[PDB]
């Protein structure tokens, strides 16, 4: 106020200067992703998709180095656009040199100031520009919220996110904003929480915290299923638990994003995976 800093913040930060990107994938819905700026172009690690949000770490050799949560990769720089977000502050704060409790003061910001968000989810801070002064301001000092404040954890936030897509049409290979397949809905929802998961159900099945007992399932957990009787050992489907014994999924049965009764669903579970941590 403005000097008070919580002991819960680290006294040190390795957070690198980043900007915000939105994928535009011109002319299509996807872009190949690589693990270097000089890749074996035949061996892309995966793809990223239209209207996904990323952090931009930099550019090299015609590629953008992008980040979603703990995952980073390289995509053609023409597949995304840089984003800045105008907002205002609601409480006096300092712009600090870094997102920690030992940064130097770049600029005092009075309450009600017009600012521009340049990066988000910076370990409890936004990176902003105020009157040309650039640095890190505590998240709660700004009006804009990059994710929901409501919810006890990111799992509940993920459940709300898939609920916002109820009624969207099923289309194989899509991940929003208007059409989805089962695994694209999962990846999209966690993209909006700055959490990376892979694109296909059979890989989503292999990461995240394993919830061994279904009694311990919570909103935002994903459930993978084996639904192909001609390949009965292969994971082919996925949905998100949203509480009260229901999960939401994009299904060809109805060709729509819809609720489904978990225990009445007539296909075997593979794993229950928790990709949220807070």
Numbering used by the authors: -2 to 275
Lines quoted from the article behind this entry:
We report that T. vaginalis has acquired, by lateral gene transfer from bacteria, genes encoding peptidoglycan hydrolases of the NlpC/P60 family. NlpC_A1 and NlpC_A2 consist of the C-terminal NlpC/P60 domain preceded by two bacterial SH3 domains. The NlpC/P60 domain adopts the classical papain-like fold, with a central β-sheet of 5 strands displaying an antiparallel arrangement. Hence, we concluded that NlpC_A1 and NlpC_A2 are dl-endopeptidases with specificity for the tetrapeptides in peptidoglycan and with greater activity toward monomeric muropeptides.
The structures of NlpC_A1 T. vaginalis AG_119910 (TVAG_119910) and NlpC_A2 (TVAG_457240) were determined by X-ray crystallography. The similarity to other NlpC proteins allows us to assign the active-site residues of Cys179-His234-His246, present in all TvNlpC/P60 sequences. The active-site cysteine is located at the N terminus of helix α3, while the two histidines are in strands β15 and β16. The active-site residues sit in a “T”-shaped groove that is bounded by strands β14 and β15 in the NlpC domain, with the cross of the T formed by the β3 strand in the first SH3b domain. A surface electrostatic calculation demonstrated that the slightly positively charged active-site groove carries two pronounced areas of strong positive charge. The first of the two areas is adjacent to the catalytic cysteine, and the second is at the base of a small pocket at the interface between the NlpC domain and the first SH3b domain bounded by the residues His195, Tyr43, Trp44, Tyr46, Phe193, and Gln184. As expected, mutation of the catalytic Cys179 to either Ser or Ala in NlpC_A1 and NlpC_A2 completely abolished their activity toward PG.
